[PDB]
Design a binder for this molecule. Structure first.
Ligand SMILES: Nc1ncnc2c1ncn2[C@@H]1O[C@H](CCC(=O)c2cccc(C(=O)O)c2)[C@@H](O)[C@H]1O
Ligand code: MET
Ligand code: SF4
Ligand SMILES: [Cl-]
Length: 380
């Protein structure tokens, strides 16, 4: 009664070896395990096969093998802050609480360029490396507005990296400006855009996208705007909204499109699964998937996305425990709101995040825009 304890005790390489020598493991799971040992790409039908057949333990062996081969114990997080230009939107995403169908313009606010600069200036004494800019799409927040803001932010703090806006936003403002995607992203980069976050991906396949995100930019337009960014030397992230009404093959379709794009242009850094949460949206009725399904999803993302450096977990949207366990199922990269401020006159701190990473035996690296170390907290 120590067979399972023996398995759990094995290093990463030997766990993979043990699974390959198990006579009772189905031939198809072995063949995928051998592909991972040989650094061979997993095909679409193999991806769907993992989702529909592979257990958590098996997926851990393969995902953690790939994660440790690429990163060892390195677990990355950056020091950034968020500006939300508006919390109302012209689109109707069924999963989103900003949908024009459940939130009128009057419940909401709209920042001016002055307002965004006043928020940015509050961080002037923080060693933040990056600002994340995202929110609703509204017609007053146009190409002119965002180019004006990028120029002011770059003149005020030239070394602050601007990770601003998704293809959902760029499709809208380029179409209104009458700019091609290439010319628009070129213009925005000159004004001071540095990279795009991975938002607005949802699920790409029309069968799902028509039902959860009908009106905003489609898969073709999302991938095309990332292509133009990559051709201009910009790095970008990619997301996938999972655990709602999609089938497993929709997730593999989504990752397959991302993987081909990455083969063409190579500018993706991180793939960020986003777990559907059924609070405060028109998908209220839709049941959330289990923690086991979240961990299997990170694992298959690590296995499938062989040309993406980083699998990233957004800590805000999941339990502490799921975030921590994800670091053993393919995740090397963490996004959170780091908040180290002392409340003078009466939130995840760096110390709390460093402790969560060390608790599951990982090396917490605070990283810069190039994913190089600012502080290696394993030596602190
Ligand atoms: N109910 C929901 N349940 C789950 N997800 C929801 C819900 N509502 C909205 N979202 C998601 O938020 C995204 C925008 C945020 C985003 O992509 C992001 C976040 C952190 C880091 C980066 C990065 O690139 O570093 C990008 C939307 O596209 C949507 O898919
Ligand atoms: C706040 S949602 C993320 C940004 C953009 N509105 C999108 O759907 O892509
Ligand atoms: S576009 Fe982005 S913000 Fe507007 S509704 Fe859809 S998800 Fe929410
Ligand atoms: Cl985003």
């Amino acid at each position: 009664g120590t067979e399972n304890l023996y398995f759990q005790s094995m290093d990463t390489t030997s766990k993979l070896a043990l699974i390959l020598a198990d006579a009772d493991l189905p031939a198809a799971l072995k063949a995928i395990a051998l592909k991972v040992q040989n650094q061979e790409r997993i095909t679409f039908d193999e991806g769907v096969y993992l989702y529909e057949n592979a257990e958590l333990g098996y997926l851990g062996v393969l995902a953690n093998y790939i994660r440790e081969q690429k990163h060892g114990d390195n677990t990355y997080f950056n020091r950034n802050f968020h500006i939300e230009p508006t919390n109302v939107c012209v689109y109707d995403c069924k999963f989103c609480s900003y949908s024009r169908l459940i939130k009128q313009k009057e419940e909401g606010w709209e920042m001016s360029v002055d307002g965004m600069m006043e928020v940015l200036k509050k961080y002037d004494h923080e060693p933040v490396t990056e600002v994340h800019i995202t929110g609703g799409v509204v017609p007053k927040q146009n190409l002119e507005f965002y180019s004006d803001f990028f120029r002011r932010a770059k003149a005020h703090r030239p070394e602050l990296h601007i990770k601003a806006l998704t293809p959902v936003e760029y499709y809208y403002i380029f179409k209104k400006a009458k700019l091609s995607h290439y010319d628009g992203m070129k213009y925005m980069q000159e004004a001071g855009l540095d990279s795009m976050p991975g938002g607005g991906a949802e699920i790409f396949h029309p069968e799902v996208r028509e039902k959860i995100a009908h009106d905003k930019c489609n898969a073709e337009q999302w991938l095309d705007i990332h292509e133009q960014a990559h051709k201009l030397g910009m790095k970008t992230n990619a997301t996938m909204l999972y655990g709602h009404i999609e089938q497993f093959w929709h997730r593999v379709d989504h990752m397959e499109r991302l993987r081909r794009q990455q083969d063409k242009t190579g500018g993706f850094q991180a793939f960020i699964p986003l777990k559907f949460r059924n609070q405060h949206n028109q998908m209220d009725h839709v049941p959330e998937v289990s923690v086991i399904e979240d961990l299997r999803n990170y694992a298959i993302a690590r296995i499938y996305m062989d040309n993406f450096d980083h699998i990233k977990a957004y800590w805000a949207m999941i339990s502490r425990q799921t975030a921590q366990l994800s670091l053993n199922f393919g995740v090397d990269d963490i996004d959170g709101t780091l908040d180290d401020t002392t409340k003078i006159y009466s939130a995840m701190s760096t110390r709390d995040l460093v402790d969560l990473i060390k608790q599951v035996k990982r090396k917490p690296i605070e990283r810069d825009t190039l994913y190089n170390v600012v502080t290696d907290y394993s030596q602190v």
